[PDB]
């Protein structure tokens, strides 16, 4: 009976406690047309988040994403790994690295993200996001997408 807590376990939890995704948007990477804006803290694990995006986003060759996030804790190499799941099948693997995060900072992060109809995809796509500081997994979050 009992458990172990490491310094890395403490740090992971402390980063997550101090971390908040404040807002996020998606634009058509070519035209710059704003497709979706959201304010849900998608860093929160355990729960299933939801996002309702317009059907027209599927016609985009590439999407520009902008994230605004706050962090109480310092991070050396803040990064995201993302998986696009369709009915549990991983369609795409993405990798984004921000780098150093100043303690008690608010930061902005822009990323470029490059067949099935909206009627099939809607409610069946899950984006899983893993938040790291280098080796350290801080959070795993899930967002179910609806194409509306």
Q: Spell 44-54 as b/e; 16+ CB within 10 A means b.
A: eeeeebebebe
How many angstroms separate the Cα of 99 from the Cα of each of 91, 103, 106, 111, 133? 26, 13, 14, 14, 9
Cα–Cα distance for residue pair 108/89, rounded to 1 Å: 31
Beta strands 48-53 and 136-147 are parallel
Task: For the sheet with 105-113, list strands across it.
Answer: 34-38, 19-28, 63-71, 105-113
* Nearest in space to 52 (alpha carbons), one of 35, 27, 69: 35
Burial of 1 (0-12, 13-18, 19+ CB in 10 A): exposed
Domain residue spans of the chain: 1-148
What stretches of the chain adopt beta strand conformation (E)?
19-28, 34-38, 48-53, 63-71, 75-86, 89-101, 105-113, 125-133, 136-147
- Reported resolution in A? 1.8
Residue pair 133/76 in contact (Cβ under 8 Å)? The answer is yes
Q: What is the CATH number of domain 1-148?
A: 2.70.50.40
């Amino acid at each position: 009976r009992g458990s172990h807590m490491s310094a890395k376990d403490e740090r992971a939890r402390d980063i997550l406690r101090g971390f908040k995704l404040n807002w996020m948007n998606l634009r058509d990477a070519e035209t710059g047309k704003i497709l979706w804006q959201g304010t849900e803290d998608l860093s929160v694990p355990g729960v299933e988040h939801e996002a309702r995006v317009p059907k027209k986003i599927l016609k985009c060759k590439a999407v520009s994403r902008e994230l605004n996030f706050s962090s109480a804790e310092q991070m050396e190499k803040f990064r995201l790994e993302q998986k696009v799941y369709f009915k549990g099948q991983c369609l795409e693997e993405w990798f984004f690295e921000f780098g150093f995060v100043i303690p008690n900072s608010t930061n902005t992060w822009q990323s470029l993200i490059e067949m099935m109809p909206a009627s099939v995809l809607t409610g069946n796509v899950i984006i899983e996001t893993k938040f790291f500081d280098d080796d350290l997994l801080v959070s795993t979050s899930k967002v179910r997408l609806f194409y509306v």
